[PDB]
From TrEMBL, chain A:
Gene responsible for this protein: mukF
Protein function: Involved in chromosome condensation, segregation and cell cycle progression. May participate in facilitating chromosome segregation by condensation DNA from both sides of a centrally located replisome during cell division. Not required for mini-F plasmid partitioning. Probably acts via its interaction with MukB and MukE. Overexpression results in anucleate cells. It has a calcium binding activity.
Protein localization: Cytoplasm, Nucleoid
Subunit organization: Interacts, and probably forms a ternary complex, with MukE and MukB via its C-terminal region. The complex formation is stimulated by calcium or magnesium. It is required for an interaction between MukE and MukB.
Homology family: Belongs to the MukF family.
Protein's recorded name: Chromosome partition protein MukF
Automatic annotation (TrEMBL), chain B:
Organism of provenance: Photorhabdus thracensis
Protein name: Chromosome partition protein MukB
Family: Belongs to the SMC family. MukB subfamily.
Functional description taken from the UniProt entry: Plays a central role in chromosome condensation, segregation and cell cycle progression. Functions as a homodimer, which is essential for chromosome partition. Involved in negative DNA supercoiling in vivo, and by this means organize and compact chromosomes. May achieve or facilitate chromosome segregation by condensation DNA from both sides of a centrally located replisome during cell division.
Cellular localisation: Cytoplasm, Nucleoid
Entire protein: shown range: 1187 to 1235 of 1482
UniProt subunit comment: Homodimerization via its hinge domain. Binds to DNA via its C-terminal region. Interacts, and probably forms a ternary complex, with MukE and MukF via its C-terminal region. The complex formation is stimulated by calcium or magnesium. Interacts with tubulin-related protein FtsZ.
TrEMBL record, chain C:
Protein name as it appears in the record: Chromosome partition protein MukB
Binding site for Mg(2+) 2: S40
Organism whose genome encodes this protein: Photorhabdus thracensis
This protein's domain notes: The hinge domain, which separates the large intramolecular coiled coil regions, allows the homodimerization, forming a V-shaped homodimer.
Record's subunit section: Homodimerization via its hinge domain. Binds to DNA via its C-terminal region. Interacts, and probably forms a ternary complex, with MukE and MukF via its C-terminal region. The complex formation is stimulated by calcium or magnesium. Interacts with tubulin-related protein FtsZ.
Role summary: Plays a central role in chromosome condensation, segregation and cell cycle progression. Functions as a homodimer, which is essential for chromosome partition. Involved in negative DNA supercoiling in vivo, and by this means organize and compact chromosomes. May achieve or facilitate chromosome segregation by condensation DNA from both sides of a centrally located replisome during cell division.
Binding positions (ATP): G33, G34, N35, G36, A37, G38, K39, S40, T41, G75, K79
UniProt binding sites for Mg(2+) 1: S40
Residues of the whole record sequence present: 2 to 149 of 1482
Domain of life: Bacteria
Location relative to the cell: Cytoplasm, Nucleoid
Annotated MukB N-terminal domain residues: 1-148
UniProtKB/TrEMBL annotation, chain D:
Protein name as it appears in the record: Chromosome partition protein MukE
Keyword Cell cycle: yes
Family, similarity comment: Belongs to the MukE family.
Biological process annotations from GO: cell division; chromosome condensation; chromosome segregation; DNA replication
Alphabetical keyword list: Cell cycle, Cell division, Chromosome partition, Cytoplasm, DNA condensation
Pfam families: MukE
Protein's cellular compartments: Cytoplasm, Nucleoid
Species the sequence originates in: Photorhabdus thracensis
Record's subunit section: Interacts, and probably forms a ternary complex, with MukF and MukB. The complex formation is stimulated by calcium or magnesium.
Length: 49, 49, 148, 212, 198
């Protein structure tokens, strides 16, 4: 009967001393937004062997 | 000395071991150790077959 | 049992080849010609048509063989011309079925020298049809055009 | 002799960095994920080379820490080379409730599988429902639309805690999940029966927690 | 084991910092003397080190280094906004020949603001701020704010260096070429850059 009182009172009265934990939050790797793929179209022609 | 005790008090693992008295905690830990050893013995016996 | 065989390889609008078809041999096929003629290019076209995974394809020079280089350029883009391109294989199955696998290749407009691949397969094609003619349209006086 | 690994690096550290598990783990760790006992591969790896990893990461001005419960995590210093961030108060409410749920022997029979509804029911049983509703919307007074909005925010924050490694969803059902020991960090303000103010001061001094 | 030169490279005191930067997406140009020299010296091994993350270490033909993630990247990815590429292509255009005589390499925020407003079409500007907007002062103020914001993002990427004072005047680095057009034999850079901007 040790933690019941210990933890319940903390949740019940949290807003009298609100506190927050710290975490590692390394940056995301920025990349180019992919534009719509634009292929090369040229209607090539030539003499057939 | 007080500092030492204070230091240690935080380091308790979970509820069944929440004896706020470190020295008292020791034995509980060791109890766990023995428990675990028995479970390991049974599991390795199962593994053989 | 009769093992399957590769009948032929076809290239369209590659660097130096407009529309060419090599007929493979049952045992050995040899390519000869002076430096820069285009032999290694033919090899590259074949392997590309076999494994279109663009993450893997990496055509190093024969010199510098075996050196894991991570080169900026994989060396495929330059072997293609502007517009649409093809690379196809004709295969005779052990069941004596004619199947044509291949890929459509196309350069990507933009600073990065990227390439686009779209595989395809054809089954049941009549034995009288040649891939060179199937992939081109006769426009004008013997001045054929390639079709997407 | 020259051109010898020992000149530049301890052999065990190089051996660790060359392992196939390292890139995954590194990536994750940097992202803030906690590592518990269930993900054996990772955990075991951590255990094997603990001191080398600690020494390594030290270069970055970050502590690789081991909680008593057996879970590893990253704590950045003030001079950290890697950014540091803080959790929201709703995340704390859900965190402390998940902690009480883990301890509860009354629900141990579930074999760790809990449902979002049970979590929500426990939370409203303990905290001030109508006063907590203030965080969802400044005009909330017990309306069902607002109650569903609260449930959806809980659903969202719980998903964030999953990315942190604090809870694992079932393989085929997303309405049910399992807890891990990493949740005990939410009890860092009460694990010792002492003056709350002094505890809080100690925590902020250690870099564990910030006020709001 | 591990290659000796790779162990040497990552043992160097400069590595942690550069690692941090690179993972963020920053581009290393010829300006950063020590970092650039370090990469030049240990490229052959750093490329292998980062390949283990399914991320590619590329040296641009102009000379600057940067990382490119694959689809299977181990590093969490993120993507720029449309307005970001618009501004980037504008900066690429400003890397012009008369620039040398016009500004001696040092620009101002107003140059970019006015260039952006003059050269872009109104429809995509509205799409940038909000479709409900129509030629109003508050919309232009919001667009200015967004321009400053994205310019700071680009400064993070290393594209643009702010002169060390509170005022918003800057210089453009060579790495801006990453936004640039494809170059074909004999083509004029101004024309091709404008052609894409259109
Ligand atoms: N990626 C490329 N970009 C530009 N030109 C290329 C590219 N790859 C090959 N070439 C050129 O295409 C021509 C054909 O080269 P290829 O290697 O296929 O010839 P080859 O007959 O096999 O020569 P060798 O026997 O000397 O290897 C050569 O002029 C080569 O310079
Ligand atoms: Mg060759």
């Amino acid at each position: 009967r040790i933690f019941s009182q210990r933890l319940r009172q903390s949740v019940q009265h949290y807003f009298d001393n609100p506190w927050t934990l710290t975490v590692a939050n390394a940056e995301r790797l920025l990349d180019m937004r992919d534009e719509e793929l634009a292929l090369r179209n040229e209607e090539v022609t030539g003499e057939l062997p | 000395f007080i500092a030492v005790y204070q230091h240690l008090r935080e380091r308790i693992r979970q509820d069944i071991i929440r004896t706020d008295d470190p020295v008292d905690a020791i034995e509980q830990m060791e109890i766990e150790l023995a428990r675990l050893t028995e479970e390991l013995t049974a599991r390795e016996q199962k593994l053989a077959i | 049992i009769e093992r399957g065989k590769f009948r032929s390889l076809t290239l369209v609008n590659w660097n130096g080849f407009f529309a060419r078809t090599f007929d493979l041999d049952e045992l050995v096929t040899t390519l000869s010609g002076g430096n820069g003629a285009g032999k290694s290019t033919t090899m590259a076209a074949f392997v590309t048509a076999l494994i279109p995974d663009l993450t893997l394809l990496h055509f190093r020079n024969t010199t510098e063989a075996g050196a894991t280089s991570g080169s900026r350029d994989k060396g495929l883009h330059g072997k293609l011309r502007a517009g649409v391109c093809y690379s196809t294989l004709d295969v005779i199955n052990s069941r004596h079925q004619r199947v044509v696998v291949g890929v459509r290749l196309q350069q990507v407009a933009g600073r990065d020298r990227k390439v686009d691949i779209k595989p395809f397969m054809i089954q049941g094609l009549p034995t009288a049809i040649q891939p060179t003619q199937l992939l081109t349209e006769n426009v004008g006086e013997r001045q054929a055009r390639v079709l997407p | 002799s020259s051109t010898h690994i020992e000149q530049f690096m301890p052999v065990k550290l190089a051996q660790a960095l060359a392992n196939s598990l390292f890139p995954e783990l590194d990536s994750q760790l940097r992202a803030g994920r906690h590592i518990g006992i269930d993900d054996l591969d990772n955990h075991a790896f951590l255990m094997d080379f603990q001191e080398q990893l600690e020494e390594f990461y030290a270069r970055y001005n970050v502590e690789l820490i081991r909680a008593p419960e057996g879970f590893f995590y990253l704590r950045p210093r003030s001079t950290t080379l890697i950014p540091r961030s803080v959790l929201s108060e709703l995340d704390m409410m859900v965190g402390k409730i998940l902690c009480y749920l883990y301890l509860s022997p009354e629900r141990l029979a579930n074999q760790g599988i809990f449902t979002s509804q049970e979590l929500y029911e426990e939370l409203i049983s303990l905290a001030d429902e109508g006063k907590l509703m203030k965080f969802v919307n400044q005009r909330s007074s017990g309306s069902d639309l607002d109650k569903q909005k609260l449930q959806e925010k809980v659903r969202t924050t719980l998903n964030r805690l999953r990315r942190l490694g604090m809870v694992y969803f079932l393989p085929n059902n997303n309405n049910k999940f399992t807890i891990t020991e990493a949740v005990f960090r939410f009890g860092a303000d009460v694990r010792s029966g002492d003056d709350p103010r002094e505890i809080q001061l100690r925590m902020i001094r250690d870099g564990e927690a910030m006020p709001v």
